[PDB]
Amino acid sequence: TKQITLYTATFSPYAHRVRIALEEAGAEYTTYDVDILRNMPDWFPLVNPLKKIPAMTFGGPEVPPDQPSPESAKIAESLAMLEFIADLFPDAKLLPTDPVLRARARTFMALYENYVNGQFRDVWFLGTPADPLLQALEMLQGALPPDGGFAAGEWSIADAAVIPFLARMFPYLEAGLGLYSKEDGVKMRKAMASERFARIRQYVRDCRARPSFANTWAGDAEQVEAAKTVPMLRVGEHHHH
Amino acid sequence: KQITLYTATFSPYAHRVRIALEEAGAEYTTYDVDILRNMPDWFPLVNPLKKIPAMTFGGPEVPPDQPSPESAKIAESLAMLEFIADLFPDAKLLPTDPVLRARARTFMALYENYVNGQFRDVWFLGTPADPLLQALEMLQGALPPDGGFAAGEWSIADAAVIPFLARMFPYLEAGLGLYSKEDGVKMRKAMASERFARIRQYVRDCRARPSFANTWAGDAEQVEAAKTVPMLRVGEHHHH
Ligand SMILES: [Ca+2]
Ligand SMILES: [Ru+3]
């Protein structure tokens, strides 16, 4: 019955991970928006000294989110939060019970974190070449079960970890958001619509169809608008190679 | 079910998993792979990513250089750590309390997300050491200040991190890595200063456990194995 408060921002795929998991858990929780990139509140380092979103408080006396209590546990890092929610709500089966299937989930999260996430960041924020991102996405696609289903078969926190980024890619590309070149925008849009990426399109549709996604997504147009507020997405700048 | 870990002495990522297997009291086989200079043509059958460590689980007992298509192939060292914890619950490789478990997962993410890349920049590119020392101070601050491991009791979080911290000191003393002598001196002084007393206690506490002693070749031996790593460019240093 200990309280959960998630500090969030609409643009953030990392916060989105945790909202998805909390929905799948059936948890009671509070969200509180934080303008982390333009106007961080003076109290925010009390809930996350790293000064990043998401931040989570757990337990302690019930207080307004902008008056955080010293008594609540302060939990940082979205993948730690995903495992925490699985630990708190074992009856929700947010991970498999079989160790090998659980490892498929953990491996999928590590493949995304270690080989895809940095490519999304670099292509979008630095305009680095798109081909290494497409290669890493093909690798990640290859880890999915071939016939359908989610990363570990049944839905798990591995799918909460990955869908926020994949689901943003398609509308961001269509809206021309990102510092990559025109040439690489075309390349990416064609690749992601090609037979090469049919399996990951099915995966994105299957994850997006769940209520946990519908109830935590502002809508494509609204997410695009939130992304336009991000200082690092400098409108009118592109990098070419 | 059998466990085989494909390993290499120089590798801190493989080292993570050896430590956890020792703490679990698991029965397992290790098999060295010259992954950076002479990868066997069968190795992509155990890990298509072509990285160490690799792990097979179950299947028929076969020699490690003839892996079975029937064994489960597990990739990524942190996934292996959580796997071992799931396989050996009586070994208590994670806390049982959710908040203490989250401390362990957070500590692992802090290392992966903030510290490892700084070690890579400094050792492989010779970029300035100050951001690395800053990141190490942050990680140090996540430890319980008065003593203990990352989550209190020992856990896989400490398996995840000690291979990298333990290599830092003898690599610095050997001058191995692309950083300049000037930054080498600076790092050695900083890591001996009261600024970093807490992380020195942490390294001592982790190194003192049998799981470290039994998976460490010795400082001089580990330095010699690291000199075989192409990206450490033995004899080479970048300046300013
Ligand atoms: Ca496959
Ligand atoms: Ru390496």
Q: DSSP of B72-84, one letter per residue?
A: EEEE-HHHHHHHH
**Burial code of B113-141, b = ≥16 C-beta within 10 A, e = fewer?**
bbbbebbebbbbebbebeebbebbeebbe
DSSP state of B121: I
Q: Which among A79, A81, A100 is the nearest to B57, CB-wise?
A: A100
**Count of positions (residues) in chain A:** 241
DSSP reduced 3-state for A155: coil
Amino acid at B3: I
- Kind and range of the H or E run holding B118: helix B116-120
**Burial code of A126-138, b = ≥16 C-beta within 10 A, e = fewer?**
ebbbbeebbebbe
**Shortest-distance ligand to the CA of residue B12:** 2
Amino acid at B160: A
Strands B3-7 and B29-32 come out as: parallel
Chain A residue whose CA is closest to B108: A80
In the numeric block, which tokens belong to residue A146?
């071939």
List strand residue ranges (DSSP E) for chain A, in order. 4-8, 30-33, 55-58, 73-76
Cβ(B130)–Cβ(B179) below 8 Å: no
Cβ(B8)–Cβ(B17) below 8 Å: no
Looking at the complex, does the CB of residue B101 fall below 8 Å from at least one CB of chain A?
yes
Contacts of residues A205-214 at CB distance under 8 Å and 24 or more positions apart, as own/partner, are A206/A148, A206/A149, A206/A150, A207/A150, A207/A159, A207/A162, A207/A163, A207/A166, A207/A167, A208/A163, A208/A167, A210/A24, A210/A155, A211/A23, A212/A19, A212/A20, A212/A21, A212/A23, A212/A24, A212/A160, A213/A20, A213/A163, A213/A167
Chain B residue whose CA is closest to A49: B138
Q: What are the residue ranges spanned by the domains of chain B? A: 1-96, 97-240
Mutate to test the interface with A, among B83, B87, B121, B155 (most CBs of A within 10 A): B83
Listed by number, the residues of chain B in 7-46 with a beta carbon closer than 8 Å to a beta carbon of chain A are: none
Chain A CB contacts of B112 under 8 Å are: 113-114
Q: Which among A59, A80, A88 is the nearest to B105, CB-wise?
A: A80
In the numeric block, which tokens belong to residue B77?
């060292």
DSSP reduced 3-state for B55: strand
Looking at the complex, does the CB of residue B83 fall below 8 Å from at least one CB of chain A?
yes
Tokens 């491991």 -> residue: B149
Q: Do A87 and B80 touch (CB under 8 A)?
A: no
**Burial code of A33-72, b = ≥16 C-beta within 10 A, e = fewer?**
ebebeeeeeeebebbbeeebbbbbbbebeeeebeebbeeb
Alpha carbon distances (Å) from B195 to A50, B136, B137: 19, 10, 8
Mutate to test the interface with A, among B13, B46, B82 (most CBs of A within 10 A): B82
Tally DSSP H helices, then E strands, for chain B: 11, 4
Using only C-alpha atoms, chain B has a radius of gyration, in whole angstroms, of: 18
Looking at the complex, does the CB of residue B98 fall below 8 Å from at least one CB of chain A?
yes
Distance from CA of B128 to the nearest CA of A (A): 21
Tokens 């070994």 -> residue: B91
